[PDB]
Amino acid sequence: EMVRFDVGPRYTNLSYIGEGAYGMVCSAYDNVNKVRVAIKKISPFEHQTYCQRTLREIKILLRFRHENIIGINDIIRAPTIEQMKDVYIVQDLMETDLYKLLKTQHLSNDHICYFLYQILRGLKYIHSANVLHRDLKPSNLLLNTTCDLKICDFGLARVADPDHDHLTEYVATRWYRAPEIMLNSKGYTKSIDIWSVGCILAEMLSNRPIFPGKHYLDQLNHILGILGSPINLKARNYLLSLPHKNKVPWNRLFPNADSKALDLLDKMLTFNPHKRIEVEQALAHPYLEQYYDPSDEPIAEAPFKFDMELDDLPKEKLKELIFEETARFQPG
Numbered sequence: 001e002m003v004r005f006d007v008g009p010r011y012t013n014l015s016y017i018g019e020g021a022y023g024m025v026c027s028a029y030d031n032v033n034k035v036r037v038a039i040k041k042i043s044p045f046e047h048q049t050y051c052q053r054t055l056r057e058i059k060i061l062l063r064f065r066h067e068n069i070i071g072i073n074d075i076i077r078a079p080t081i082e083q084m085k086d087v088y089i090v091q092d093l094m095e096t097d098l099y100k101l102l103k104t105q106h107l108s109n110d111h112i113c114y115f116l117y118q119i120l121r122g123l124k125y126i127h128s129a130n131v132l133h134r135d136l137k138p139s140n141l142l143l144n145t146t147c148d149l150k151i152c153d154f155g156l157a158r159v160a161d162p163d164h165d166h167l168t169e170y171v172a173t174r175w176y177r178a179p180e181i182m183l184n185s186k187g188y189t190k191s192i193d194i195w196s197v198g199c200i201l202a203e204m205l206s207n208r209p210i211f212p213g214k215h216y217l218d219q220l221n222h223i224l225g226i227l228g229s230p231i232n233l234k235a236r237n238y239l240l241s242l243p244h245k246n247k248v249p250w251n252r253l254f255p256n257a258d259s260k261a262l263d264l265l266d267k268m269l270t271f272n273p274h275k276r277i278e279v280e281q282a283l284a285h286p287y288l289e290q291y292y293d294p295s296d297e298p299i300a301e302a303p304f305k306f307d308m309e310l311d312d313l314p315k316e317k318l319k320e321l322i323f324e325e326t327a328r329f330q331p332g
């Protein structure tokens with residue numbers, strides 16, 4: 001143990017990396033496989049949406065298997081469900097993320113291009129499984145080298161559902177939230193993930209968030225402040241009929257940017273979801289022609305039969321399902 005509480009076996013001499021939703025996140029050492037790994041410690045059993053995000057990320061990441069998607073190595077808990085109050089997710093130790101990198105470094109076009117490729121390569125897998133990440137942002141893209149990118153945090157990950165109408169349903173990180181979400185186009189579409197990637201590409205090009213709104217109405221203010229002016233929004237919230245703006249050309253916002261990059265950016269940051277470019281079409285863009293290779297882009301074996309449509313479940317129940325899932329990592 002230490003200070004920062006935790007429990008090895010089978011990992012020792014850890015190190016603080018920070019705290020997110022629930023504590024460490026600590027870089028410990030592996031006794032069996034002989035490496036430095038990253039253990040995440042979760043204590044979600046006090047609320048409902050907490051275990052939900054815990055059970056989701058566990059169920060999904062175990063079934064996923066891709067070079068651009070973080071994997072679950074080990075999960076250690078108390079052998080009895082009565083004592084189980086903490087969960088320890090063990091994952092590969094990554095050096096940093098795209099968020100930290102963009103604070104200390106201007107990325108070259110070559111590096112930006114391959115970073116974009118790896119993200120979409122990972123997204124291609126996710127979407128082929130009919131799954132939405134819903135929370136893509138630079139801090140959720142882990143990096144080891146320029147050629148090693150891994151998507152993480154699937155706590156908000158839903159199975160796609162374009163046909164179904166979902167202050168409930170929360171959240172997508174504001175700066176990277178697609179316009180359709182804020183205008184109650186309630187369907188869970190794959191287009192929301194592409195929007196995030198668009199914002200992410202825009203952020204790589206200039207080391208700053210393209211739409212850094214304060215609140216969700218200010219977010220739409222920023223979005224329309226670039227794309228210009230385009231009503232189904234039945235809140236208020238209605239009075240967005242304010243200063244009408246013309247669409248700002250990307251080459252004026254990013255003058256030193258590769259023209260093919262800016263062209264793909266325009267197609268990802270499209271206001272209308274139905275017009276917005278899909279993941280395969282994105283990879284097949286002239287901007288990624290030197291990397292695009294379907295034979296080297298593994299997709300999921302089969303689309304996900306639903307996330308069990310689980311939202312309103314008692315916490316003592318999904319307590320067991322986590323216990324049922326994680327039972328494989330017990331030595332017995």
Ligand SMILES: c1ccc(Cn2cc(-c3c[nH]c4ncc(-c5ccncc5)nc34)cn2)cc1
Nearest residue numbers: 019020021025038091092093094095096152153
């Ligand atoms: C609480 C909850 C969720 C997160 C976000 N999240 C992090 C990982 C992760 C898995 N393995 C890693 N290895 C290294 C690093 C890392 C991060 C920031 N700087 C350096 C290294 N992050 C992860 C998955 N999801 C964070 C805290």
